[PDB]
Amino acid sequence: ERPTFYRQELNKTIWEVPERYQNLSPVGSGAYGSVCAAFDTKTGLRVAVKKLSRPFQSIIHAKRTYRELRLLKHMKHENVIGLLDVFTPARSLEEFNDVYLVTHLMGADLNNIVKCQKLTDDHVQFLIYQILRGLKYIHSADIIHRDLKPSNLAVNEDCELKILDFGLARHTDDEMTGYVATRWYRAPEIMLNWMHYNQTVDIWSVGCIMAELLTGRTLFPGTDHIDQLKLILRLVGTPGAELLKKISSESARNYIQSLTQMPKMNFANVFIGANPLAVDLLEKMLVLDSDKRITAAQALAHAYFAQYHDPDDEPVADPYDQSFESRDLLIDEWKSLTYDEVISFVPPP
Ligand SMILES: Cc1ccc(C(=O)NC2CC2)cc1-c1ccc2c(c1)NC(=O)C21CCCC1
């Protein structure tokens, strides 16, 4: 059952994929990786195929490849990107040096669709419903997206949404620097490294997406980390003494206390004309103290989603075993674990 593969040059690299995959063409400005759209003749689905190129060139690359393939194989929810196929042209471990990952092709990301545009309330309901329903799941598997922004929500022409990139986020100093969308969605505890963080960081990010869809404006379009934080504290207010205690970075805690105290603003005088149910929800997602933000499961029950909420159709995941993260292994060792996971792979129905 080893299929026939054919060769094609795309993205200035040779792609070698099963015959079932036809009409490959690069998508994104290169924004998503080496990703091509293709037709799967075997399932009749349009798919995105991502080739990981020379993916075991270092220990850190052999472990990312493994981590992405683990994450991907774990996720089976309508609103989360998952694997329809993984393959390699390799006939053995010896020969293993390329992994291709196949998932659904939705066609665009939220970014392209809505940039600079204000969405109607029922449109925002449905898109955020799906983000929280997707995140309910992610979070139940004990995984943290950590980098939830519009560009890595994949959306089709029916405004159906799959979340991309959960658990992989590792931007450098310079990608996070200045006036850049790659930071406008980050929870302050994470942008400024205040504490040992958990999953509540992704509900902060939904709060930012949700406000932008509702007003057509970036919520916190900071020109740098500090300017962005100043933008944050002015709306939600400066930390209380409760929160300052939980800020384990003494360094960051000391700079925070430097700032002149400000009250939390009135969200109804910010989000003028907006469904009060939207504003109530914004209010409980955009709380500075991470321990007190609303959760994905709690938010799904909120009245604002009265029209979509079904408690028996909002599933959870099995646990995700990330014990491998705390493990220091050789290149061959990650490679072999990654091989194991490819050949053991089972298609969905
Ligand atoms: C092909 C692919 C493989 C993996 C991941 C991914 O999320 N990995 C991290 C979760 C571990 C995302 C895509 C990917 C990248 C870009 C797109 C799609 C899929 N599906 C799509 O529809 C698009 C192409 C049009 C914009 C979104």
Side-chain angles (χ1 to χ4, degrees), residues 1-11 13-169 171-349:
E1 71 171 342
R2 196 216 166 255
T4 296
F5 297 55
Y6 70 105
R7 286 170 52 214
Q8 184 161 7
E9 198 172 26
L10 309 125
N11 285 345
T13 198
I14 279 95
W15 284 56
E16 177 153 19
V17 306
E19 296 183 292
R20 69 191 277 182
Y21 303 107
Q22 294 294 308
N23 311 323
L24 306 224
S25 63
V27 311
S29 27
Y32 312 122
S34 269
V35 179
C36 292
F39 198 46
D40 195 7
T41 56
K42 195 151 191 144
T43 59
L45 297 175
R46 280 308 270 195
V47 294
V49 187
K50 160 199 267 198
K51 174 190 197 195
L52 311 178
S53 202
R54 320 284 221 197
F56 313 104
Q57 67 180 312
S58 52
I59 292 208
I60 302 294
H61 288 212
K63 191 172 188 185
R64 292 188 157 146
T65 304
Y66 182 64
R67 179 189 299 126
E68 188 172 0
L69 176 49
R70 293 295 306 280
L71 286 165
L72 279 175
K73 286 182 76 168
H74 197 82
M75 302 285 193
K76 292 174 226 287
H77 185 273
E78 313 199 70
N79 297 118
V80 195
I81 225 42
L83 274 186
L84 299 162
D85 190 23
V86 55
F87 57 82
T88 177
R91 293 178 155 292
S92 59
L93 181 55
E94 292 41 269
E95 273 217 70
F96 184 44
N97 202 36
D98 289 310
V99 194
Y100 300 76
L101 302 152
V102 179
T103 74
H104 276 99
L105 185 81
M106 300 299 269
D109 68 42
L110 194 80
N111 218 237
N112 313 146
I113 337 278
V114 319
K115 60 212 176 328
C116 298
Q117 301 193 24
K118 172 169 134 73
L119 266 48
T120 78
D121 194 47
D122 176 64
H123 210 196
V124 187
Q125 292 184 30
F126 181 49
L127 286 171
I128 316 295
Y129 174 75
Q130 294 176 96
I131 295 150
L132 294 160
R133 179 179 184 254
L135 215 65
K136 199 197 172 171
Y137 179 95
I138 288 164
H139 285 186
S140 63
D142 292 308
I143 297 157
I144 306 146
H145 186 300
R146 65 200 97 239
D147 197 39
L148 204 40
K149 42 216 182 97
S151 33
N152 61 22
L153 299 171
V155 193
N156 71 33
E157 312 202 22
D158 303 350
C159 282
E160 296 170 329
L161 179 150
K162 285 170 199 326
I163 301 170
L164 308 183
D165 265 288
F166 33 80
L168 266 153
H171 307 274
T172 87
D173 294 330
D174 195 73
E175 273 128 289
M176 290 291 287
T177 293
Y179 188 72
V180 285
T182 83
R183 197 197 60 241
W184 295 338
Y185 306 87
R186 296 229 140 177
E189 60 263 17
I190 172 158
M191 177 175 85
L192 280 170
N193 299 307
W194 283 353
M195 54 197 93
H196 272 349
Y197 61 86
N198 63 13
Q199 67 184 30
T200 46
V201 309
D202 300 320
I203 284 286
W204 178 275
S205 315
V206 186
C208 298
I209 299 161
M210 193 176 157
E212 187 173 349
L213 297 185
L214 283 170
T215 63
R217 293 289 124 234
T218 326
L219 191 61
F220 311 114
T223 63
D224 57 74
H225 296 64
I226 293 306
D227 171 64
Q228 185 169 340
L229 170 71
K230 281 144 150 216
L231 292 181
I232 292 162
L233 296 178
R234 148 86 58 211
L235 171 76
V236 315
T238 48
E242 277 195 40
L243 182 57
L244 291 161
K245 267 189 329 186
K246 311 179 196 172
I247 289 176
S248 90
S249 187
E250 183 149 64
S251 199
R253 195 183 62 237
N254 151 94
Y255 160 76
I256 271 167
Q257 304 181 331
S258 87
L259 288 162
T260 319
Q261 318 206 34
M262 295 171 296
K264 176 189 158 281
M265 279 176 49
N266 204 307
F267 281 35
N269 276 317
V270 177
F271 302 110
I272 284 133
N275 188 348
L277 286 173
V279 182
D280 191 78
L281 200 52
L282 286 165
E283 279 181 335
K284 321 182 148 142
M285 305 190 298
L286 295 190
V287 154
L288 188 54
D289 189 342
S290 70
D291 281 352
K292 284 176 177 171
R293 272 161 218 170
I294 200 158
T295 73
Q298 273 146 27
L300 280 169
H302 176 275
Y304 182 53
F305 305 117
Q307 293 282 301
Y308 297 91
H309 183 51
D310 173 7
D312 289 304
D313 194 15
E314 280 172 5
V316 300
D318 313 307
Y320 175 66
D321 181 331
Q322 64 212 328
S323 67
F324 72 96
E325 292 289 356
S326 67
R327 209 152 276 140
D328 284 75
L329 305 158
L330 304 170
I331 308 166
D332 319 90
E333 290 177 315
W334 297 115
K335 197 198 166 164
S336 182
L337 289 175
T338 293
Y339 195 59
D340 272 19
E341 288 286 350
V342 168
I343 76 192
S344 73
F345 172 80
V346 177

mmCIF file with all atom_site columns, all heavy atoms in Angstrom, residues 18 27 53 280:
data_model
loop_
_atom_site.group_PDB
_atom_site.id
_atom_site.type_symbol
_atom_site.label_atom_id
_atom_site.label_alt_id
_atom_site.label_comp_id
_atom_site.label_asym_id
_atom_site.label_entity_id
_atom_site.label_seq_id
_atom_site.pdbx_PDB_ins_code
_atom_site.Cartn_x
_atom_site.Cartn_y
_atom_site.Cartn_z
_atom_site.occupancy
_atom_site.B_iso_or_equiv
_atom_site.pdbx_formal_charge
_atom_site.auth_seq_id
_atom_site.auth_comp_id
_atom_site.auth_asym_id
_atom_site.auth_atom_id
_atom_site.pdbx_PDB_model_num
ATOM 1  N N   . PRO A 1 18  ? 2.110   11.803 -3.349 1.00 0.00 ? 18  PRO A N   1
ATOM 2  C CA  . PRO A 1 18  ? 1.181   10.829 -3.892 1.00 0.00 ? 18  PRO A CA  1
ATOM 3  C C   . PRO A 1 18  ? 0.356   11.357 -5.058 1.00 0.00 ? 18  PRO A C   1
ATOM 4  O O   . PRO A 1 18  ? 0.014   12.558 -5.095 1.00 0.00 ? 18  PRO A O   1
ATOM 5  C CB  . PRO A 1 18  ? 0.258   10.568 -2.726 1.00 0.00 ? 18  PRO A CB  1
ATOM 6  C CG  . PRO A 1 18  ? 1.027   10.954 -1.529 1.00 0.00 ? 18  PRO A CG  1
ATOM 7  C CD  . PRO A 1 18  ? 2.242   11.623 -1.896 1.00 0.00 ? 18  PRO A CD  1
ATOM 8  N N   . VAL A 1 27  ? 0.259   28.794 -1.810 1.00 0.00 ? 27  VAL A N   1
ATOM 9  C CA  . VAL A 1 27  ? -0.660  29.797 -1.210 1.00 0.00 ? 27  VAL A CA  1
ATOM 10 C C   . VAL A 1 27  ? -0.028  30.511 -0.009 1.00 0.00 ? 27  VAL A C   1
ATOM 11 O O   . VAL A 1 27  ? 0.850   29.972 0.653  1.00 0.00 ? 27  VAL A O   1
ATOM 12 C CB  . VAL A 1 27  ? -2.069  29.265 -0.821 1.00 0.00 ? 27  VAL A CB  1
ATOM 13 C CG1 . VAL A 1 27  ? -2.688  28.482 -1.963 1.00 0.00 ? 27  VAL A CG1 1
ATOM 14 C CG2 . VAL A 1 27  ? -2.022  28.441 0.408  1.00 0.00 ? 27  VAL A CG2 1
ATOM 15 N N   . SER A 1 53  ? 10.786  21.104 5.080  1.00 0.00 ? 53  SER A N   1
ATOM 16 C CA  . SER A 1 53  ? 12.011  20.913 4.308  1.00 0.00 ? 53  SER A CA  1
ATOM 17 C C   . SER A 1 53  ? 13.236  20.697 5.213  1.00 0.00 ? 53  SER A C   1
ATOM 18 O O   . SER A 1 53  ? 13.471  21.485 6.158  1.00 0.00 ? 53  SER A O   1
ATOM 19 C CB  . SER A 1 53  ? 12.246  22.148 3.427  1.00 0.00 ? 53  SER A CB  1
ATOM 20 O OG  . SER A 1 53  ? 13.076  21.834 2.338  1.00 0.00 ? 53  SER A OG  1
ATOM 21 N N   . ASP A 1 280 ? -20.605 42.941 27.816 1.00 0.00 ? 280 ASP A N   1
ATOM 22 C CA  . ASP A 1 280 ? -20.505 42.079 28.984 1.00 0.00 ? 280 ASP A CA  1
ATOM 23 C C   . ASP A 1 280 ? -19.409 41.030 28.763 1.00 0.00 ? 280 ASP A C   1
ATOM 24 O O   . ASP A 1 280 ? -18.538 40.866 29.586 1.00 0.00 ? 280 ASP A O   1
ATOM 25 C CB  . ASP A 1 280 ? -21.859 41.404 29.264 1.00 0.00 ? 280 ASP A CB  1
ATOM 26 C CG  . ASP A 1 280 ? -21.898 40.689 30.623 1.00 0.00 ? 280 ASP A CG  1
ATOM 27 O OD1 . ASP A 1 280 ? -22.049 41.378 31.672 1.00 0.00 ? 280 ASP A OD1 1
ATOM 28 O OD2 . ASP A 1 280 ? -21.798 39.430 30.660 1.00 0.00 ? 280 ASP A OD2 1
#
